[PDB]
Design an enzyme around this catalytic site. Structure first.
Site, PDB file in Angstrom:
ATOM      1  N   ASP A  61       0.826  -1.191   0.000  1.00  0.00           N
ATOM      2  CA  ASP A  61       0.000   0.000   0.000  1.00  0.00           C
ATOM      3  C   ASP A  61       0.862   1.244   0.000  1.00  0.00           C
ATOM      4  OD1 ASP A  61      -2.798   1.119   0.229  1.00  0.00           O
ATOM      5  OD2 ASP A  61      -1.931   1.966   2.074  1.00  0.00           O
ATOM      6  N   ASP A 201       1.052   9.876  10.597  1.00  0.00           N
ATOM      7  CA  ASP A 201       0.005   9.466   9.685  1.00  0.00           C
ATOM      8  C   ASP A 201      -1.122   8.676  10.340  1.00  0.00           C
ATOM      9  OD1 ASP A 201       1.037  10.708   7.487  1.00  0.00           O
ATOM     10  OD2 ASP A 201       2.537   9.141   7.168  1.00  0.00           O
ATOM     11  N   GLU A 243      -1.446  14.280   9.778  1.00  0.00           N
ATOM     12  CA  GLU A 243      -2.304  14.112   8.618  1.00  0.00           C
ATOM     13  C   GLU A 243      -3.687  13.707   9.115  1.00  0.00           C
ATOM     14  OE1 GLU A 243      -3.604  11.748   6.120  1.00  0.00           O
ATOM     15  OE2 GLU A 243      -3.805  10.164   7.601  1.00  0.00           O
TER      16      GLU A 243
END
Lengths: 544, 544, 544
Positions: A61, A201, A243
């Site tokens: 990913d 993240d 994020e």
């Protein structure tokens, strides 16, 4: 020395190591290659390199599925290389930060594997387990197109585990103190090597509680404050960016308590900027930009919004929007331009049909709005993209340096390239590359460099106030930035036609505006309205 | 109906039939093809097609070496095609003119062949023969690098003949009355087919007299006055354009007696216009353009200057200049870019290194200065050159229509193309063609179209006066064009930086200026200087 | 160890210095570039470099118009570079020769300029002058489409001069003993610097006599015998080659008196070889080669034919033919490919529609027929042409080295190249270049290299006899070459289909034929016909 809040006057440059420069000539870019190109980044004028993940990974990913937080993937070099990068960047006045996924690891992470042969073991409860898949039912499925799950059952353990992302990215148990300590160790690992910070993240999904949404939980914000405290303790002048793929209002909470000036994350990203600007240009009116500027809550003094010209965050190929707080929510998909790139990441020139005037307009706004801007590698020369591969996430094509073989990225055989160089008749390297750009004084690169340089000589752009000017013309957006005696006037035309704008600049009566690009003195500001004329999609920057 | 001075408000389009469109699919463009593309020319908005030479020819000098005035080279079609062309053009509001070389013919022309075989027969004195090379010694040799004398000796006749051009282009004796009528005969032939006029080529050299340098002689001018008289007599609404590679002061006599409003040539070309704009943009000052506007003598009421954006004449690859009267004479030489083009025809975008902003600037000027403008085929989409083809041809490459095979010019095998299509990574057809341009609303093609259209709606551009406006900023050229209630303001920035210009428009107090591109109404003109702001190499048109 | 007749086993490599390698990076190839590429020439295996004219020249005729015989065109370097070329080549076992035009010079040559200014001075009778235009009337005009006379009148001198080539190439008066001595001086100048010889250009036209056609005259041959005597006296092991675009029967006289073994030109070229092989392949029968082989007279023992795979000599762009002695005279014409490249130099691969099997057949024959072969630069990797650059220059494109910018020829900007790199989808540099070729073991380049090395291990190819073997199959050409225990059998299929050939090899009964490419031993030769099978356009070489 010492600069605790340097990120407020920073311009960041996001770079894919795999795709910037190949020194070993094996078809894959490496830290050494990036080290070899530090001279360019300095010439460009950026202040901080932002590395996309280089950690060990099955690469299932985009490398956001991490298998070892403390090992650098062999393709990219070793930890010795990384140390040299941080050091040679610092010697050039350039900082370094990196993406780091806090929420989940790959299933191929040893902790995972050791959380299932023995549940008794120290790693046994590192992930979120439950006998039923009914727990946390009001948490949406992020990847609704691929995952029927948010709990999937693992046989070797004989129980369900939790994951807000893909089934090969199991979430970490953040109620477990050993996880809170192991992950905090990881941060220290990299901080010890000299990294100047991180983008944490997927932090909205750290903690889950029954009965809630399982994002933005107060337990989550508590943990991040813990992280800010420790980092501030052991290392000076470091930065934490969040994020958070959420509306900038749920996001303002990741900054922590405003009374301290900020005790949580230093920066978070203001995702609706690019879509609202996009929208403004299409309808040729300033309001979509005006609204978010005004409806954004104030943030603590020492915090910063991050802005970049993209419509999606990268860990979730989604546009950040909200059916109840975004008045333009339903309008985006009524642009067949916009609706074709929904799930797909696109580079700036393609998003704008390679329109130079619009490229300048968007980048001008990016560099002047209140925040700290992020450039994505390749945009400064007008690189294109290549859907078809992978994609939805590529735009990770090799940086285009020279008109030589492989655009100068690698001397290898093309067959050995991790991704092909774009050979497109419009964005292909035989037409678009850094060397051609550099030698041509009228290029987008040379323009961007000049702009970056104008911005550096004016700290007001990162530090100053923002007050928008009333103007009879809905097509023009004019605002002023002031940081104590350092004042600029920024005027932007959203129409494709030439437009007059009449500004009441009486607050600045007596001042002689100096235009930034050329240093020319404009007539002094009197008390009658000041007429500026802009061409289609034009902009001017004036010093006052 | 009824319109003798139509050329004054005309926009001309110069086209190489050989290179515009191929219908037979043999690799050479033809009249049939041009007819098929008339719908495009109508769409673009031009008023008159100007055809490059299509006559029977050995083609040793670009088709300017005519071997038969009344035959079309079979390669291009037949006279029926020519007649169908003119008729289909007229149906669309488009007129047609052609180059025609008056001074000399090919040596392979039957008149010559008979003037070498039969010195005593009827053609014996169609050319200028002499037993010696000691004559007209004050005439410079034009192609001084290729030709050692202006006299060359013929083995079959045993005498020298005269040629101001190449050895294979012998001059016609215009002292012979049979020659004067043979040429008028030639003019009538085409006028009877419906042609709307000619550009009479190389007329400065019609007559030679001892004691003179053999240019611009009064005998030449009388013959031309004679020509218009007969043409005016037998044909309504025709135009004679003079090609005179001479200084605009020496050129003015070709217009005839100012008392008549004009009794000689209707149009002549103002060759120094482009070099002055070029030098002006380079020096970033208005003066080189202002000077010619002011130091150019007045011409008869019904005559007009022809202007085009090229540095050279096409029959004599020379830049028109004058050591005693040209303020810039020695300065063209100090300019490295100017000096690099020997005497080479280049298309506009190569001439400006594909700077979109400058392409617009130069074309705005071409379309707004006092005269009737000539567009060259291909410039409207930004076509380039191929200098390696030389003898001009550089600029006589195939029109680039589609991204299909051969740019859509022909379906033939590339091996049979008369000249190759540009495949260059910058101007090559996979990137530059009419089809891409049309589908992109921001394209140069669409811009040129909007420009021609607003110009059509304002006859002031062709008929009106020229008044330059004083302004403290030397970088900006601002002028007004007025034709009885049709008044426009034109403002042009020669600097690469944004520039303010302050204009005294008090003669127009109360007017609300309307910008031509977008139709936006600007603030009313007051008593104070009016402030216009231009971006680098920008321009505005305002109606008053 | 002297080797007076080294050219008999030499393979020559013809190179355009301008187009081989650019070291200065100014867009023009130079001797330094050539010096730098000597290791490649050694790798390939060639024995002698042949330089196209490098002299000071106005370049109005490919540099065959020499303006200073003892000066190198600055564009290519200086005499210091040349001395180093000769030395570095010699170090590697490579000799160097050059074209030199003996017959005429440029009008820009100082001798000419002083021969027309000052008829009384030392150069006054260096060129052929006349008060009249009538002398030497039986010489055809070679460039008949361009030139009306072989005499042209000079205005400064007041007389006609003689020229068999273009008017700007006036002939030298070889009746003047000082001219005969000036040209030997020119010759020695270069011989002193170490050049190994010359191809003396246009020597068939040196002397002119009233009564003749002014070719092949005994006065001409006498002088050449005189030149050879001096070269042999003062310099060891040098070679003189004659370019005589003539029928091989008229050419043989240039070898001089056979009794002496050869006392004039060492080599001359056999021009009909390539046209005859070409026709042989087209009609798929051996006969056209058999015939010129039979009508080629024996030559003195120490002389050699030069062969190359081209249809035109390069100074005139004419194919050698002769209507009364070439039985194929009219057949070249009915041959549609042949007739389209009529005055155009084409490279081997275009001439053969890029058919690799035919490239091998033709090259095999080039290397096995009796003579010393000349390879043209670029043919060894299958380079193409660009006929649009003018049928000489078509074949003078930059050598294609790597797939980097400008094919690796130069690091300059493309606009500065003397001629563009071929970018065609079949022969363009991105597909065809030495680096790609050398890395591919199955390539035409690697094949050619092997072939050259096989030829080198067998001196019979240059020194041995030639006997054609009778065979019932007309499509196969079979011959044997013998040089005292070095004996080879060569078999070539001119049909595009597989073909049998049955050979009577009883002269070699008992022998085990060994195939050259692979060294495999074939069945012993018996009393029965030996059966060889070849694929379409195939060939085999056997050692016996």
């Amino acid at each position: 020395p010492r600069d605790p809040y340097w990120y407020k006057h920073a311009v960041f440059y996001e770079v894919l190591v795999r795709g910037f420069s190949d020194s070993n000539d094996d078809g894959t870019g490496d830290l050494r290659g990036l080290i070899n190109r530090l001279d360019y980044l300095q010439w460009l004028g950026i202040d901080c390199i932002w590395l996309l993940p280089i950690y060990q990974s099955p690469l299932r990913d985009g490398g956001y599925d991490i298998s070892d937080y403390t090992k650098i993937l062999p393709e990219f070099g070793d930890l010795g290389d990384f140390v040299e990068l941080v050091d040679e960047a610092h010697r050039r006045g350039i900082r370094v930060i990196a993406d780091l996924v806090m929420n989940h690891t790959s299933d191929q992470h040893p902790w995972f594997q050791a959380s299932r042969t023995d549940p008794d073991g120290p790693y046994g409860d590192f992930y979120m387990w439950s006998d039923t898949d009914d727990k946390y039912p009001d948490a949406r499925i992020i990847f609704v197109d691929t995952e029927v799950s948010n709990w999937t059952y693992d046989p070797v353990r004989g129980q369900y585990y939790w994951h807000r992302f893909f089934s090969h990215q199991p979430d970490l148990n953040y109620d477990n103190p050993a996880v809170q300590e192991a992950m905090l160790e990881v941060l220290r690992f990299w901080l010890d090597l000299g990294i100047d910070g991180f983008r944490l993240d997927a932090v909205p999904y750290l903690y889950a509680r029954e009965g809630t949404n399982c994002e933005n939980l107060p337990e989550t914000h508590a943990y991040l404050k813990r992280v800010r405290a420790e980092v501030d303790r052991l290392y000076p002048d470091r930065v934490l960016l969040a994020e958070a793929n959420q509306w900038p209002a749920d996001v303002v909470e990741y900054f922590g308590d405003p009374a301290t000036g900020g005790d949580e994350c230093h920066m978070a990203f203001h995702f609706p900027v690019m879509p609202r600007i996009f929208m403004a240009v299409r309808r040729e009116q300033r309001y979509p930009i005006s609204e978010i500027m005004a409806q954004t809550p104030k943030i603590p003094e020492n915090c910063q919004w991050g802005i970049f010209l993209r419509n999606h965050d990268e860990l979730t190929l989604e546009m950040v929007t909200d059916e109840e707080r975004d008045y333009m929510y339903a309008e985006y998909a009524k642009d067949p331009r916009m609706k074709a790139n929904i799930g797909i990441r696109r580079r700036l020139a393609p998003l704008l049909d390679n329109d130079r005037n619009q490229l300048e307009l968007f980048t001008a706004l990016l560099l002047s709005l209140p925040g700290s801007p992020v450039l994505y590698y390749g945009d400064e020369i007008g690189m294109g993209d290549n859907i078809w591969l992978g994609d939805r996430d590529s735009v990770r094509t090799p940086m285009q340096w020279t008109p030589d073989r492989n655009a100068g990225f690698s001397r290898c055989d093309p067959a050995r390239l991790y991704l092909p160089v774009i050979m497109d008749p419009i964005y292909g390297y035989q037409a678009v590359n850094v060397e051609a750009q550099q030698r041509n004084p009228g290029s987008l690169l040379n323009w961007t460099r000049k702009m970056i340089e104008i911005r550096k000589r004016h700290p007001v752009f990162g530090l100053g106030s923002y007050v928008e000017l009333p103007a009879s013309n809905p097509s023009v957006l004019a605002f002023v930035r002031e940081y104590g005696d350092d004042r600029v006037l920024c005027v932007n035309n959203l129409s494709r036609f030439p437009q007059p704008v009449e500004l009441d600049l009486r607050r600045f009566e007596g001042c002689t505006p100096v235009e930034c690009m050329g240093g020319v003195q404009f007539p002094a500001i009197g008390e009658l309205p000041y007429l500026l004329t802009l061409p289609g999609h034009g902009f001017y920057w004036f010093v006052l």
